[PDB]
Structure formats: structure tokens, C-alpha cells
Amino acid sequence: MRYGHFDDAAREYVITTPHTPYPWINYLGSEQFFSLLSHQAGGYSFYRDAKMRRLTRYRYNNIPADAGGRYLYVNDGGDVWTPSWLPVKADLDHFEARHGLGYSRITGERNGLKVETLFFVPLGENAEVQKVTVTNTSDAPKTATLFSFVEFCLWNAQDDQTNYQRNLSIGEVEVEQDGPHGSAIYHKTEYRERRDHYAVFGVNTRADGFDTDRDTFVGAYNSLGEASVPRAGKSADSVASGWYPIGSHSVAVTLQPGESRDLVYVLGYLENPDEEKWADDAHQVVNKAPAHALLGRFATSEQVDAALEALNSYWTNLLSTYSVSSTDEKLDRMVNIWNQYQCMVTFNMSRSASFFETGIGRGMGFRDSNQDLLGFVHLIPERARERIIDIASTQFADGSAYHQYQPLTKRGNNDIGSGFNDDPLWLIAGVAAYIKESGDWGILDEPVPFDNEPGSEVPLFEHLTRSFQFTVQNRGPHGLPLIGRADFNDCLNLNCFSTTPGESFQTTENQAGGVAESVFIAAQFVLYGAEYATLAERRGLADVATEARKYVDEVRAAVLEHGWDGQWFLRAYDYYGNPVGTDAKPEGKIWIEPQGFAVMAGIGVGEGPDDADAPAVKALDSVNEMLGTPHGLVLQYPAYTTYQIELGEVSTYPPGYKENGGIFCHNNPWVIIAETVVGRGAQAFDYYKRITPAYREDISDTHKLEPYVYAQMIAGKEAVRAGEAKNSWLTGTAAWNFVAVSQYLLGVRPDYDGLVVDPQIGPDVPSYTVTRVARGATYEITVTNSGAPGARASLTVDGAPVDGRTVPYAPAGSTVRVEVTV
């Protein structure tokens, strides 16, 4: 069973029923203002920060799900329906929802009236525009009233949902029926005090009426599906005082057969300078100038269409950096459109706001934003350069860091814990990737404060040395890095020992002492320590580089000596010094993360893919045999069936979910990449397909979530719900798969001085072409691929054969033709 289809030419996913297994959403906007838009028009908008500047209210875990969004009630001769289907659920003759790049279009038709809404966030605007086209599709004239509807939230979503004792008395609006381009409603809660910002909701016509009070619009004892006002057929002209402000206009339209009318609605976010806050000397009336300017920019359909065409050109431009043409259209749509689009969204949202993340506790993750950069750097490197500075600024002088920062303020906080010892290294990961991509070595000289302290700036490079040294000076008795609160796995809490309910493993106090070490961090360190060494040698820091390589060698020696179980890598040593992830325990025998990552670091790699004796092969075969399911690879096996007090959160999940035997998808690309490292492209591609949206569209009823984006987790073999995903959209899986497919499968990756072309995808993709713009030159890379295990590529460049797989960077403006034979 499927619920829609990809449309590669329009770069859309087309949903053909409202009856999906779950609400399927798109993200609007890519700059500073964002909207979550479901296929039923549900969701909300915020400016910069989903907790602190949320414009409109949304209910997570509503009954039913997703009843709450931007609605347009049509009253046609007393019959009331919404083209989004929800909330009225009147029978529709046609329904369709198209999610595209930065816009969606939702169409519903019933009894000869077709209503189509195009939704998007324009470039350079802090606003969500809707363009509504109403068409008479019957053979008689029609007269209908359209009631727009949005529910405001009081800015601070946390306060909005818990602090009624205060907030039910503060709701404030103004109403401007006869504005310069049509009618507007102004939501200005707290603008009388410290807020310099307000929201507008307006339409490009003089409305017949309005409502700004939820209770009046909907009616006592009514859900949104039963709203009184649209049923009555006329606006109640309600002016809110406290309670629940809304934005709503009514417009009556008369249409002859085949005739249509357009309407443009804007929900905008505005700020004024402090001394330009008020229209009047008494400071009672809001200064509407920036709201009138905004409404003036979307007063016509023409203005809307121009914006939508610009947004398209922005996306075409964005997608011109990496693309592929092959015999596999699933592969292609993922690589050309969707995985890149998703990577923009994760770069913007980190893990804060989705239909699973609530946009309250989580801000921008230190580890999360660094990893996202890996799939984002080729898109817009100037924005990646900024993000690195923002991130490194939340670093402490001892090289440890705040685990996340608040998007509005860019200041770090401990709301989801502190002292994750894998954090510091991801910074090196992010800078290495950015430099390989852009060649912008000057970033290493950027002055960057610790903990945003004015006057504490040092060069970025120095933050990396802090990161590196943090791990050097925090190893345990085996030479492996101390784990601290948790490593890459948030639920491996080895310093916790909590027997007190209700307090979060993420924020709860940890024990000083013990000897808990992480095999994962060991690998991470070998990988990014080597990169650090490379940056040091290039800054001209010979002793530093030398010293750095001595430490890397030591730590990799320790992985081989103390971090190997026999058929796989060990996961860790607990508080007590006992091994975690050994065949000597009955549960949690093998954990996936060090298998993927130690192999990417090159640890235990042998002569080739057929070297059954190499540790890397052995590890990967164990991952194949014990962790493999048709939905991907589970995190560990077997899952823990009882609470293991020494391991923290991990065994708190029922088997087969999240970190206790779920397919935690973001560690899957590591095994994929590893598999290419040992020369088993076939298997790597196999693993790629198990978790990839386009190959799972065909089991939409099982996956349940959006079929065009990666999800955080898919229930494992031990779950009753095996195969069903949770937490879609916001996940490091997106950037990690992008890195996997674009760089190791298809094999095109930037290095410092050239572009590496090293295909390893197996025989399912026998021929394909990649166009990669790197350092202002275009590389047209034509691959003939036999997929033979261990077969690695040879190159010709502009007709001459070359040595190895690195193509030195041509000058800006050239086109370089690479012919690849595997």
C-alpha cells in the first residue's frame, strides 16, 4: 500500500488521500522563519526559535492528531467544509496535497467549488503566505463565504501551555478592517511590555468581517470541526480580551461557472525599533508601518508568483552542486532532491521542532549541528562557516562544551545535560569537512570566544586544539577515552546509577570517579585526531602535529589491544571496569557504533574484502549476522529485557525501540561507509536501501511516517511494531546518509588538495554520471562500474590517464571531464 507518489520533474511528493497512516509534514522557509505544514494544513510557525517566538499554537497529542492549523472554512449555501479535509471531515470529491521545496499546495473540492491553497515562506521574508484560488466547477453560479482561521500562541510556547494562571489575562489584539491593501488583525500580546515584536494576519481585500476570539469563533462545547461562525455564515466581529486570540477574516465570493478568484493571506512576524514602537504618544496603538509594507509586498497574485518563481530558482541553484544521473531513479531522487532538501531542514532545525520534537527543551545541538554540517557544507558554505563560529563559541576553555545552545540567543545551556565527552571532537569533524569543501583555510584564524565571553576570543584553530587535548587528558586505564555522561549514544550512561524515578537520565547528577571508557570515542578520536594532525601540519605546527599523531597511534593501539572482543569491537568499560558489548554477557552482546566507526577510522582493516581474518571483516560480518533486519540494522543485540542500572537510560526502553534494539538510523551510514572501506560495495548499497525513503515508499503502511524523509528510528526485530518509524525529519541520519551515498557509494568526496573519485556501490548501479561543482569548477564524472568486490577505480582526466583517485582542483571556471573505470 501507498498514499501518493514522487514527481521528480516538479520536485514534489504528491499525497493523494487525506487518510495517511500519520500526518505528513513539510517545512516551509530556509532562513530565519519556519512553518511546519502537514498535508492537512496542520502545524505552526516561528521566528528563529520554536520555544521563544512561536507565532501560532499547535497541540501535540491532540485527539485526533493534527486538528489545528491554517484553515479555510467554506460555507456554500449553508454547507460547511474545509479543503484540508480536517477539521470538518466533509466528503471531498477531489483531494490532493503536494509537498515541494519550500512550498506546499493543498487542494480540496466539494459540490462544485474547488479551493486550492499554495503555502510558502518567501525569501527574505519573516512570513507565511497563502494564495488561495477558489474555482466554480459546476454549471450554475455559486455564492460562498470563506473564513480564514489561525490560532495564535503567546510567543513563549512553554508559558503558553503551562502558565494560564497568568496568560489567560494578557492576550491582546488590534483589528484593522480598512487597511492600505485589505484587512489585517494584529496579535500583540506583551508588546505593551518587553516584546518589540507582533504578528499580523491579513488579507489582500477588504473583508466582510473578522473574528479575533477563539471561543466566539468556534462556540462553546464545539471542536474546530464544528465552529459556530462558519456554520452561521457570518463573522462575529469578535475583539479578544485575554483568553485565546485568533486571526480570521470572512470574504463572500460570487462565481459564474468555470470562474475563479484569488486571495492572498499573510501571517507575518514584525519588529520595530524601541523608539518606533507606537503610533501615538500615549503608547497605546502599535506602529503598523512594517506590517503595511509586508502586506504591500503580497497584495497581488503576480507578487506571489514572482516570489514562488524566485524560491524555485534558489532551489535549482542550491541543487546544482551535487547531482547524479544513473539507472536507478530511487537512488537519483534521493541524491538529487530529497536528501539534500532534508539536509537544509536539519541544518536549520537541529533537533528542536517537528511533529515529534516539541520545540521546547531542545535548541541547537553541539554534536547535532556539527554532524549536520557534513551534509550541508556543499549547499551553502558561507552559512556553514557562520554556524561553525556560533557552535565553537559555546565551547568552554577546557575544551568541553555546552551540549546545545538556544537558537534565539546563541547561548549554550544544560537543559538536556552536560559533559558528553564525544561532543568536543565533532567540532574537528565539522571544520575538517568545511575546509575540504571550501578550501577556506582562513576560518582557522577566525577569532572565537569561549562561552560567548567578550574578550576571550582565540583563533578557531585553538578551539580545535582544546577539543583534541580534552580527549588526550581524559583517557581511562586502558588508554580509551573516558565516557563522561554519555558518548554519541545518549543512553549509554555509565556514571549514573539512578534509582529515582521522574528525573531525566540526561540531566540527572552523575557520580564522580569510576573508570568508564568508550570504544566509540576511541574510534572518533582516531578519525578526527588524524584530521587535527593534518590541520596542525598545514598551520606550520610541526611539533604539535607530531605529538598529535603519537596520541592517535596510542589510542588506536588501545582499540586493538583492549577494545576487541574476538568477533567484534567492544562497546565500553563500565563504572567498574567491566566490558560492555561482549559475547560474555547474555544481552547487549554486540553494539553497532564502534563497528561502523572504528572501521571508518581504518582500525583492523586487512588485505581486502576476502580477508576473513581482518578484524574489520569479522566485525562487519557480526553486524550483518546479529544486527541485520530487512528494515536496517539494530543498535545492539539482544536487546535488554531488564533494567541494567549500570548502563543508564538504555535498558529503560522496551526491546526493539529507540536505543534498546531499535534501528537508530543515524549509526547505519557508518556501517555503510565501513563496508565501502573494506571493499564490499554490494552490501553497503544493500544497507543504504533498507533505510532510504525512496525504497520504503512501497511499504508506506508499515513505515507509517513521511515516505520522502529519513526518520530517527525504525522499530527493530524485537519490537511488536517492527518496521514502524518514529521521530521523522529531524535526525543526523539525513546528513550521514548523504555523506554515505554522495561520498562513499558514488564515491565523490572533497579532500584538501583535490577531489577524490572512489566508487564502491556494487553491481546494482552499473553506470552513472555525477556533476560536482567544487571550488568554482565543474567536474563531470562518468562512471562505468562493474561492482566486483574489492575492485577500486582508475581515472582519466580530460583524456589523459592519472595516478590514484585524487583529481587536483582545477581553477575556478573550468569544466573537468573525469572518466572512471571500476
Add this chain to the structure above:
Amino acid sequence: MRYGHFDDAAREYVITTPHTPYPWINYLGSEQFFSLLSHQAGGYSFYRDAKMRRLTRYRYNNIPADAGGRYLYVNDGGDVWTPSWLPVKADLDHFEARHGLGYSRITGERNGLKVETLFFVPLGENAEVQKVTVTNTSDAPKTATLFSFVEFCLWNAQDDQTNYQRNLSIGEVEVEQDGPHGSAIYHKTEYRERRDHYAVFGVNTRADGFDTDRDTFVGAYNSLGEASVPRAGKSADSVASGWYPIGSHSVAVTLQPGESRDLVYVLGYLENPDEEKWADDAHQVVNKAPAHALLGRFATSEQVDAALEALNSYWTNLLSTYSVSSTDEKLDRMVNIWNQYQCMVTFNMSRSASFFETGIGRGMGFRDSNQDLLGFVHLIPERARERIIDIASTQFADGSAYHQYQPLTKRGNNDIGSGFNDDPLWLIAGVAAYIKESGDWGILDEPVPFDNEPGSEVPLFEHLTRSFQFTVQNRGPHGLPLIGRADFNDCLNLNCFSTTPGESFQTTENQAGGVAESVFIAAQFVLYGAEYATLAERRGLADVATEARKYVDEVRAAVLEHGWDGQWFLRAYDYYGNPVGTDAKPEGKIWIEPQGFAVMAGIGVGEGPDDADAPAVKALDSVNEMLGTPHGLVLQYPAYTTYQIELGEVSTYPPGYKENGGIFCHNNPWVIIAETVVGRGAQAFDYYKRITPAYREDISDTHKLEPYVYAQMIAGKEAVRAGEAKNSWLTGTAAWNFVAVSQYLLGVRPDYDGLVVDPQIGPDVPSYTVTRVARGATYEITVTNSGAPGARASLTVDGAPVDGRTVPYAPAGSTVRVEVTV
């Protein structure tokens, strides 16, 4: 005009319609387990802590309000309806909700089936029991299937609403269709790990079938009001795995004409010792002994009836301490039933969990629980004793205190602020009222820690001296006490100067320095300073008592010299030493708190009610002229129309709401008592009537909220919603009005050495009889009352006239007959 009526003989409020202005609730339970129950079965239940151990989920700000609670869907011939009206909203032939003392009955009849549900929490039990009675009222045999419905919360309410990324994978249940007494469902989320507790939802019958998974029971795209399972007339026998666990059983009923059946449903909270959590060695099956025992205790109608009678007897015995028989039945029902019931609820809940307080951030307020004692000490003094020790234990060594504590742990926290300088004196208030009531002088020698520090214990009396000394040593330039974060008005934040949005004033960092002083804390110091000196005298501390009265005197002199504005008392001095609440300012010229409280402390009292020269009289007259309204006295006049950065949170509310021009009811009884102190009984009683539930029942459509309990705030004169209440049930208004009316109007009040009988209620209650049990003896107080302004009482006791108005305490077991003439 009205939506129901009082039933005095029954001690119930009878709601005669589903269509009330807002949801109107009762609180079930008075010990450690509590239920919020709207007159449509909405709300939820918790054990000890509304945030930490919430059994069942409830959505604030739902659309519509209060779609969600304890539902019984009846399916008769495919017609589906609920006796609570919501969620299904089927037309009922008959509907009625009776809210009583610790129980409620809700009845709905439709097409020949009457369904009545009695809800209560039994004494000694952590459970909510429902006894369902279905009656066939038609002339022919009838059949139906009943579906019970409750929605589980995942225990931590904060987590339940914000952390779906984790918690959608942790919901776990057990199904027990053939238990010892009928069918039961177990909610056991996190029992796997740190929780030693689970919930049960069971019925005294072998159910036809069950459901535990919300989406299956309700169906996709459906609201509660459209649940699929009841509509199909058959349970789906769903076994939840994550997502949203519910409890539901189906039961088939057959009824001859006139015949009824009882079903008993139980929602229970159960714990096991750690060593007996599990029924099996594998640890997958919860040990059910306690649940089987609880279900056995309510297996029959008889067991239910006996518990309901024990509950009635408990309430009769609680209400036997203070009673009045008078010419005014509204005054009688308030004093005899409702205001005492409300005091029980506030003692138990503080301000944490109502239909407006969301039972997340607020625990047990230091100041609020001290004031709640004033209204509660006469009901159950033993628990008042315990409360004082729990409270005093969260005090610091310098005499300042944690502003609130967490109900589950009894540990103080700062989640809603620090350093409110009025806090320490409330401790003296609470103890004095406890000692006056009980005569338990030995509580002062109770050893009490600071901040629960093992080894830090001092006698309770030392805590009081720490409080007393905190004020003496924290005065400013005018001799008035420094205000700190705020005083009793939380919105008066004179050390704030916040220009930054999104941070609670309550919680935001305060400024060092400045000279901000409170006139309210001065009048509070004067009153309770004097009470402390008296406690010191009794203990033999003549040195301490004399110094103490000296300070009280210094402060009293300071208020007359530096806190008097001309026609009323001054409110404060701001950070820079500018007066607040002076007639020299255009806004907030007069504030109510110091007016009632200074006069309660006897500041500015003259020769009598007609001593026009006296500050107290000038102050009270100005309160009357400038703050008075048909709905009560507003906090200050005029309201602030613009943000006053130096006053903090107060000017942030729009005019006429909450602290900015609202009737903040809990400060009205001070003015009442003040009016009695000064001899203006008529005026005092007037004010009493303006804010009292019984006297406002006639305007239910205007008050909106429950007509049988006090609310926090009634929208004031300057607000478009003037007369509309918010924040019902949980307010110090209840303790303070009970004080006012029981002790100062009717005039019956315990002193240290005898019972004072000092009526001051004016001419509208010419005669009444108070029955007061004090110190083991019963006082029968027969009052004949001219009401003459200023006229005070003379007494005769057991046939003999006496001097003054204090009847020294007679022995336990006596009945003393006091004849009173005013």
C-alpha cells in the same frame, strides 16, 4: 442567570445542565490521592504530586474545553451516547451533576436508559472509585453495551507533554480479563526501570472485551466524541505497545422494565516493595497482589455504600467544630459547608493543580501553605502540625526560605523565584494560629532542620526568631523592611528592570543595591512581630520579648512617619527611593494591601468609626471611594496603562486583570477585618458579600466560574470583562474569608488564654447562634445584634455576666453557654 442550585441538607451543589459558562469541578480526596472532576467527568487524578505521579492525562486549553476524562459510552441499538454529555453530546432526556463533599454523582438518561455515576476517592485508599447504576426506565426489556474509558498519563506530566521523542516508545500495559473479581488493565510505564508503582483500571465483572490502545479505540481522524469501538459496538481487544495507553472494558447489560444494575469501576495507584515487584523470575509480569486486594475491597455495591457513608461521617465530624445558625441562609451555607470544604482543598493542593494551575511548576507555596493554615487549623490540627514542620524545614538558617517545595519530596526549590521578603513572617502567622487553636505550646520545642539538613535541627521557636530577625536586619532608609524580589504581591518587582522578553519576572535575575522598601511587609511585621513577642513572653524570654516589641514600635512609627500618603497608606519605595502608591503619581495612586493590613495591625486606629481624624478611617474611606465595585475591591487605582519598567510584572497585565486593577480577592478580607477592627461592621459585611460564592450565585453568567467556591481574581472595573472570574478554587481567598467571617464578622476567635466573642457584622444579621468546639469544650454562642455602628459586645457565661469579650477556656467535655449582646 443560574445553572443549578445549592442543596444544604445534602451538602451538594446541584448542576442542572451540561451547558455551564465554564467547566465546574469538584476535588475528590483529602489525604494523599486526588481527583479533579468536572461536571462532565473531565479532569484527572494524581498521587501526592500532580506533576510526578499523574495517573490519567488531561489537556488544558483543549478545543472544546474539557473533552477528556472518565467516560462511559453507552451503545443501545447502535445509538451511542454518554451520560456526561461530552464527548458525544447526544441529546439527553435528563441530565444532572451533584458535586458534594469528596464525591459527585453525574446522571444522564437517553431513550429509556438512565446512567448514574457516583465518583469518589475512599478514605485510606489511593483510588478513584466509580459506582455506575444503569436503570431501564422504559416499559420494555432493554439491552446495551457499556465501554469504560480512561486515558493514562505517563506519570510525569511535564514529560508526558513535551518528550514524545522518548515517551511514544515507553507506554506498557498488562491485560487481565479473568482476575479474582472481574477484569483489570495495568498501566505500568517505567515500572520496568525506576518506578515501583503502577496503575490499575478494573471493573467488578468479567468484561466482554477490552482496549488499551487509544488509536484503536478512538480510530484515526476521530475525536473522543466519535470513538470507533463504541460505534461498532465491540471492543477490539487492543494491547498497547507504546503510543497512547488507555483503560477500557466493555460490559453487556440486560434490564427488565424498572430494573437496574450496578457496576463498580476502580482506578488505583499501587506500589510494591522492590523485592516483590515481579510475579515472575524473568521480571516481565507485575506483582498484582495489591491491585487484587484493592479490587476486592470494592467488589460489591455494599462495600461502596459503606465507604460512602464513612466519607459522609468524616465530613460531618470535620464540620462539627464551627457552625452557625442565622437569619441568612447564604451566609450559613458558606460558613457551614463550602468555605470549610474549600479550605480543605487548599490545604491539600496549595496552588498547584486546578483547571487553571496546570500542576507542573507550582508545588507547595511557603507563603500560601502558611496562610492556608489560618483557615484549616480548626478542621484537623494534627495535620496542620505536620504541615508547619514540613514548611519550616525548607527554611534557611538566615531566616529566608525556599518560596515553595515539591509535594512528593518535601524539598524546597526555586522554580518560581527566590528572596520574597514577606515569606519569613508567614511562618509566625501559621504557628500563632495553630497555637491559639490547639494550645499545643510544645510544637515550639519541635526540633526542625534548615533546608532539610541532617544535623541542622533547632527548636521550631528558633525558626520563628530567624524569621523575626530576618526582617529586623533587612530594613531600608525609612525604617521599612526591604522588599527583595517581591512581597505578598508577586508582581511588585522593584529590583527587576527587565527589558528582556521570555523570562518570567518571577524567576528573572534581580538587581543588587537600591533601597526598595515595602509598606506591606511593615504592616505584616507590626502584626506578626507582636505575635512573636507573645510567643516569647510565654516561653519566659523577657529579654527577647522586650527588644522585639521595641522593633515592632520602631516599625509602627516608620509607617506613620514614612508610609502615610495623606489619605491612605503608601505602598512601597522603589529601587531609587521614589514612593509607590502616592497621589502624586497619575497611575497606581492607591494600593489595597497596606490599607487592610496596616489597620489589622492596629496602625492608625483612633477613637472610633466616626473619628474622622484617624488615618485608618481616612484609609478605609479612600479604599471605598476609589477601589470599590459591585464585584469587590480592585487592587489599585487607576490601573497602569503603560509598562513601568521599575515596578516589574504589575504593569504588564492589561487594565482590570490580575495584579493590575483586578479584584485580587485574597486581599479583600484584610479590608473586611480592618473595617471590623474600626467598628464599621455594616461596611465589612457588605464587602464580604461582594466576593462570596453564595451571594454571587445569582450572577453565574457573569462570574462564569464555580458558584460554590472562591476564585483568585475577578476582572475589575477597568476591564471589558468586569465581573468575570479566573483561577477558581485554589486561592488564599478561601482561608482569609473564612478567617474574616468566622472570626471577625461573626466574631468567634481563639486566643491564647480563652475564646474571644467580638461580633462586628452590623444590622443585616440581627440574631445568630455559633457552635464552636475549642480545646475539647463546646461553646454555644447566642448573639442578639443591634448592629449599631461601633457597638461592641457584652457577655454573660452560664448565667453570670463577665468583663470584656474573652471567655477563658473551660475544661474538655464542658458545654458553655454564652449569651451575647451587641
